[PDB]
Scaffold this active site. Structure first.
Site, mmCIF file in Angstrom:
data_model
loop_
_atom_site.group_PDB
_atom_site.id
_atom_site.type_symbol
_atom_site.label_atom_id
_atom_site.label_comp_id
_atom_site.label_asym_id
_atom_site.label_seq_id
_atom_site.Cartn_x
_atom_site.Cartn_y
_atom_site.Cartn_z
ATOM 1 N N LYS A 1 0.716 -1.184 -0.098
ATOM 2 C CA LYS A 1 -0.256 0.097 -0.133
ATOM 3 C C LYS A 1 0.831 1.351 0.080
ATOM 4 C CE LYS A 1 -2.061 -1.110 3.812
ATOM 5 N NZ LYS A 1 -2.661 -1.267 5.272
ATOM 6 N N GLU B 1 6.044 0.972 -8.501
ATOM 7 C CA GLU B 1 6.667 0.888 -7.154
ATOM 8 C C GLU B 1 7.035 2.119 -6.615
ATOM 9 O OE1 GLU B 1 6.546 -1.169 -5.059
ATOM 10 O OE2 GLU B 1 8.628 -2.023 -4.306
ATOM 11 N N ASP B 2 6.839 2.477 -5.220
ATOM 12 C CA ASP B 2 7.185 3.508 -4.738
ATOM 13 C C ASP B 2 8.642 3.767 -4.467
ATOM 14 O OD1 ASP B 2 6.969 1.383 -2.975
ATOM 15 O OD2 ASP B 2 6.763 2.632 -1.328
ATOM 16 N N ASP C 1 15.114 -0.461 -2.837
ATOM 17 C CA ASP C 1 15.971 -0.193 -1.715
ATOM 18 C C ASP C 1 17.177 -1.480 -2.113
ATOM 19 O OD1 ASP C 1 17.539 0.152 0.572
ATOM 20 O OD2 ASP C 1 16.407 -0.864 1.942
ATOM 21 N N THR C 2 16.862 -2.521 -1.945
ATOM 22 C CA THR C 2 17.909 -3.585 -2.070
ATOM 23 C C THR C 2 17.570 -4.381 -3.398
ATOM 24 O OG1 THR C 2 16.258 -5.511 -0.989
ATOM 25 C CG2 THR C 2 18.249 -4.095 0.165
ATOM 26 N N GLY C 3 16.328 -4.264 -3.963
ATOM 27 C CA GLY C 3 15.855 -4.605 -5.223
ATOM 28 C C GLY C 3 15.590 -6.206 -5.267
ATOM 29 N N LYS C 4 15.374 -6.722 -4.114
ATOM 30 C CA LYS C 4 14.986 -8.255 -3.929
ATOM 31 C C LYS C 4 13.719 -8.338 -4.242
ATOM 32 C CE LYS C 4 18.622 -9.491 -0.521
ATOM 33 N NZ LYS C 4 19.272 -8.229 -0.192
ATOM 34 N N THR C 5 12.884 -7.454 -3.843
ATOM 35 C CA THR C 5 11.123 -7.486 -4.020
ATOM 36 C C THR C 5 10.974 -7.595 -5.438
ATOM 37 O OG1 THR C 5 11.046 -6.702 -1.940
ATOM 38 C CG2 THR C 5 9.024 -6.768 -3.260
ATOM 39 N N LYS D 1 16.978 4.131 -3.803
ATOM 40 C CA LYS D 1 18.015 4.436 -2.569
ATOM 41 C C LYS D 1 19.417 4.171 -3.011
ATOM 42 C CE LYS D 1 16.827 4.086 1.572
ATOM 43 N NZ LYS D 1 16.415 3.470 2.939
ATOM 44 N N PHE E 1 16.471 6.630 6.118
ATOM 45 C CA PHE E 1 14.916 5.997 6.137
ATOM 46 C C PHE E 1 13.971 7.309 5.765
ATOM 47 C CE2 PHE E 1 11.300 4.470 7.882
ATOM 48 C CZ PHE E 1 11.039 3.182 7.267
ATOM 49 N N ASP F 1 5.710 4.564 4.921
ATOM 50 C CA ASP F 1 5.548 4.449 6.159
ATOM 51 C C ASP F 1 6.642 4.356 7.142
ATOM 52 O OD1 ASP F 1 5.454 2.107 5.409
ATOM 53 O OD2 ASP F 1 4.375 1.268 6.688
ATOM 54 N N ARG G 1 2.318 8.032 6.545
ATOM 55 C CA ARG G 1 1.725 7.910 5.338
ATOM 56 C C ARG G 1 0.771 8.985 4.775
ATOM 57 N NH1 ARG G 1 2.281 2.926 3.340
ATOM 58 N NH2 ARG G 1 2.317 1.030 4.458
HETATM 59 N N1 LIG Z 1 9.170 4.536 4.175
HETATM 60 C C1 LIG Z 1 10.387 3.589 3.832
HETATM 61 N N2 LIG Z 1 10.316 2.507 3.261
HETATM 62 C C2 LIG Z 1 11.105 1.760 2.827
HETATM 63 C C3 LIG Z 1 12.499 2.333 2.566
HETATM 64 N N3 LIG Z 1 13.387 1.434 2.257
HETATM 65 C C4 LIG Z 1 12.594 0.332 1.965
HETATM 66 N N4 LIG Z 1 11.331 0.861 2.218
HETATM 67 C C5 LIG Z 1 10.285 -0.395 2.010
HETATM 68 C C6 LIG Z 1 9.751 -0.826 3.374
HETATM 69 N N5 LIG Z 1 8.841 -1.725 2.609
HETATM 70 C C7 LIG Z 1 7.410 -1.910 3.281
HETATM 71 O O1 LIG Z 1 7.196 -1.375 4.286
HETATM 72 C C8 LIG Z 1 6.600 -2.882 2.555
HETATM 73 C C9 LIG Z 1 5.029 -2.613 2.880
HETATM 74 P P1 LIG Z 1 4.374 -1.293 2.290
HETATM 75 O O2 LIG Z 1 4.830 -0.127 2.957
HETATM 76 O O3 LIG Z 1 2.766 -1.513 2.705
HETATM 77 O O4 LIG Z 1 4.772 -1.211 0.727
HETATM 78 C C10 LIG Z 1 9.558 -2.346 1.508
HETATM 79 C C11 LIG Z 1 10.611 -1.526 1.276
HETATM 80 O O5 LIG Z 1 10.771 -1.262 -0.132
HETATM 81 C C12 LIG Z 1 11.766 -1.705 -0.992
HETATM 82 C C13 LIG Z 1 11.587 -3.215 -1.253
HETATM 83 O O6 LIG Z 1 11.001 -3.288 -2.385
HETATM 84 P P2 LIG Z 1 13.379 -3.713 -1.708
HETATM 85 O O7 LIG Z 1 14.081 -3.573 -0.399
HETATM 86 O O8 LIG Z 1 13.242 -5.331 -1.891
HETATM 87 O O9 LIG Z 1 13.947 -3.031 -2.702
HETATM 88 C C14 LIG Z 1 12.593 3.785 3.395
HETATM 89 O O10 LIG Z 1 13.805 4.283 3.303
HETATM 90 N N6 LIG Z 1 11.460 4.195 3.704
HETATM 91 MG MG LIG Z 2 5.852 -0.123 4.948
HETATM 92 MG MG LIG Z 3 7.236 -0.691 -2.158
#
Ligand SMILES: Nc1nc2c(ncn2[C@@H]2CN(C(=O)CCP(=O)(O)O)C[C@H]2OC[C@@H](O)P(=O)(O)O)c(=O)[nH]1
Ligand SMILES: [Mg+2]
Ligand SMILES: [Mg+2]
Ligand SMILES: Nc1nc2c(ncn2[C@@H]2CN(C(=O)CCP(=O)(O)O)C[C@H]2OC[C@@H](O)P(=O)(O)O)c(=O)[nH]1
Ligand SMILES: Nc1nc2c(ncn2[C@@H]2CN(C(=O)CCP(=O)(O)O)C[C@H]2OC[C@@H](O)P(=O)(O)O)c(=O)[nH]1
Ligand SMILES: Nc1nc2c(ncn2[C@@H]2CN(C(=O)CCP(=O)(O)O)C[C@H]2OC[C@@H](O)P(=O)(O)O)c(=O)[nH]1
Ligand SMILES: [Mg+2]
Ligand SMILES: [Mg+2]
Ligand SMILES: [Mg+2]
Ligand SMILES: [Mg+2]
Ligand SMILES: [Mg+2]
Ligand SMILES: [Mg+2]
Lengths: 220, 220, 219, 218
Positions: free
Chosen positions: B79, B136-137, B140-144, B168, B189, B196, B202
């Site tokens: 979300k 995608e918003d 970060d690590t690119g794993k997802t 990032k 962060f 969030d 949010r």
């Molecule tokens: N607010 C913030 N959120 C972050 C930050 N880095 C990562 N994240 C994300 C934390 N996060 C979530 O909370 C997932 C649930 P939702 O918030 O509902 O989408 C996943 C992170 O996104 C990056 C992953 O896809 P990735 O590490 O596999 O590339 C950050 O610096 N600030």
């Molecule tokens: Mg989150």
């Molecule tokens: Mg995301």
């Protein structure tokens, strides 16, 4: 704090610091959406349209904080202040509608003047015993606003405050400070957001720098 | 230019370079309007709300340039991508309303998934022989996104492109590049704009950094 | 199309929205400033309808001025809301159009006209130019009739009039605009830069003043 | 106080009544060219929608003031209504000096089929104030069972906000607590309301003509 209502035009006694746009920063053309007919006439984007709106919203907040519980008369300096002026009223209206505690006796009255010192306006004699807030788009040398404040003293007003969107860091500055400042920008010729070069570039939403081609194309 | 429609998820082959947010820049609290209830929990404002919308407006322009006259399916990763997604649709609609040459068979179709690899969605089989754009918003690590693109390849889609609002600069980054990138932000962060911290911040319109008090306060 | 050059005729004028007699919304329907609620009978036209209509007017205006420079004149200070909203959508059209010329767009001008008195700067620069007059409301049509006649003294090419509201008053002298937004009943309305003694300008909706409002802000 | 009788609409304020056979023709507002030949008339302009929702958000905050409430977006037709609702809800929170980060809103997303629900566990909604955001109420069957389904997760209260309620004779009497418009028995599209996944991007709420139904029939 309890802010005193500003009454010393050019001093900026309790003025808050504006956004400092450093020398040689900004964004290239392909970063934001720029009109095709303006794309070849712009060096770089100095301040994005969204930043302007966000800053003015804070300016409108700062202004309401000090004029809280008094009626004040705003003067729009045509025609470069139009963008700054309308955005200011928009956010002023939003404030009056979303904070409650309000009275149809503590609001604003719109006035419009054109300054070239010669004035094309209304009578302005109705500004006696009134709070005046001057809305200027940009301060360069400060000559225009200096002369205008003396001319306004002829109408026996209560207070005179100045809000300004951009102050240029020109060495030709005479020390005239606004009470509500938006941005501090470098000594370069900027266009956009109702700021013009020979009546062109007013409709540009972003604040930009004109290249050599733009000046040549629209030269009179 | 004649742009090829991207079909190599993670490569960012023809990706246009994004806005570079440098290390240790931004704005203090008193610069813009920050909700009073969040003001004590924010170090500084990294990116103003207006810059985000202005960049997203350009991304929608960039996206339309390669998908012009083609139907494509956008996927919102709930979300955190909600804000980015809604802004993207607004400016996409904007383009379609201001162009006399379009066809209702060349538009976009919305899909919504939840990724936690576990996927909460509907069929995903209807994406067979379809152009897919993942929204995608943040990366970060690119794993997802790396695993998600493999799982999505099981439904025999034609193409897979990824647009991302923030990337990032983490040294743990696996090299997954989006085809449409908005901002490149420092390794910190960030919250706001649907991003969030334990389901908090949010509703904050600006992209901000949480201070130590904020991290401790809303820790579970 | 043809570019309008007959001020008051409205030769090819499109039909506006007809706001019928005795329709609208009660107070608790939309957001009204708390300081104006006790002074308003009803909401005639919502703020959103205004923006949506003006957005369409800007489209009609650009359709006839395409590839032509035209000078818009804002009739202060009641036309301000209409004027700024009009430019916003005009910029919007120009900002997404890959077929525009910076020599062919619009030029802003500002005049103040009261009943006949004119406060302005040059207007001699409107010679051999296409002129588009931006008025908030037409009541009796006298102000606009004299102004269009006076404007004929500057040897302009064309004079077109766009108007947001036209009132169905029996005092109407027959002056028709070329771009009309709404046709409204014969009642005194405020809001959207339309005032009652410099009040109600900041009201986003177009409303009808009650008897208390008339008495309260009476001079 | 907090509405807690889903389907009753006990203290619901009466909505805007869109009468049978009123509205505007095509040439009145801005309509996408690819949709103009497929639309009979404009029922409710995009601006009226936003202005009404702005008032709904005000009404909602009036009763939920100083308490946490969880909003549920019923994808994917409520997306437009939901995002606008949050916009004005945020708008209130950004200009208010008496707000608490403990008492705000939490967004949730569910997908409802015809009765089966594709979502999360919803067990985190235990003892929470729930506000359901639905795009349109027709027969009221979908929303009736969902409220029963939601009442098994031991929530505190259940309130429903709805943008459009149709005057269909098949209505089961299910009333929302915050209603935007009361519209005629006609098939409408636009503002995230679809006909076979079409017309969602349409900003105005319109009625589809016969050619449009024929054109995009599956
Ligand atoms: N607010 C913030 N959120 C972050 C930050 N880095 C990562 N994240 C994300 C934390 N996060 C979530 O909370 C997932 C649930 P939702 O918030 O509902 O989408 C996943 C992170 O996104 C990056 C992953 O896809 P990735 O590490 O596999 O590339 C950050 O610096 N600030
Ligand atoms: Mg989150
Ligand atoms: Mg995301
Ligand atoms: N586009 C641009 N305009 C500028 C710039 N510096 C000054 N100016 C202003 C030019 N200008 C006008 O065009 C006046 C007519 P209008 O356009 O209708 O407001 C006045 C200048 O404003 C500063 C004066 O008040 P000051 O020098 O007395 O402090 C600039 O770097 N770019
Ligand atoms: N609030 C309201 N204002 C109205 C109304 N009918 C007219 N008017 C206008 C009142 N008014 C002014 O206040 C002039 C000063 P300003 O407000 O700064 O433009 C002039 C009227 O405009 C109509 C003229 O153009 P006309 O008589 O030539 O047709 C009305 O039903 N409500
Ligand atoms: N565009 C339109 N959509 C409608 C209309 N009446 C119903 N509906 C809805 C059709 N529809 C769906 O398409 C479900 C999938 P989604 O669009 O993604 O939410 C469900 C209907 O909503 C009413 C149900 O809650 P109910 O009948 O049980 O009371 C309508 O006159 N126009
Ligand atoms: Mg100036
Ligand atoms: Mg100038
Ligand atoms: Mg007038
Ligand atoms: Mg008046
Ligand atoms: Mg539904
Ligand atoms: Mg549907």
């Amino acid at each position: 704090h309890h802010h005193k209502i500003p009454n010393n035009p050019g001093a900026g006694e309790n003025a808050l610091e504006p956004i400092y746009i450093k020398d040689d920063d900004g964004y290239d053309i392909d970063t934001f959406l720029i009109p095709d007919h303006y794309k070849n006439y712009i060096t770089k984007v100095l301040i994005p349209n969204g930043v302007l709106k966000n800053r003015i919203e804070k300016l409108a907040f700062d202004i309401k904080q000090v004029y809280r519980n008094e009626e004040f008369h705003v003067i729009c300096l045509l025609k470069g202040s139009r963008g700054f002026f309308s955005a200011l009223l928009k956010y002023l209206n939003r404030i009056h509608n979303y904070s409650s505690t309000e009275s149809p006796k503590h609001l604003y009255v719109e006035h419009y003047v054109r300054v070239k010192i010669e004035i094309v306006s209304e009578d302005l004699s109705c500004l006696k015993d009134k709070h005046v807030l001057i809305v200027e788009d940009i301060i360069d040398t400060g000559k225009t606003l200096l002369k205008f404040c003396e001319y306004l003293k002829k109408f026996e007003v209560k207070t005179i405050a100045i809000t300004c969107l951009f102050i240029k860091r020109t060495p030709l500055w005479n020390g005239f400070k606004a009470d509500f400042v938006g941005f501090s920008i470098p000594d370069a010729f900027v266009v956009g957001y109702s700021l013009d070069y020979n009546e062109k570039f007013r409709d540009l939403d972003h604040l930009c720098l004109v290249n050599d081609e733009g000046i040549k194309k629209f030269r009179t």
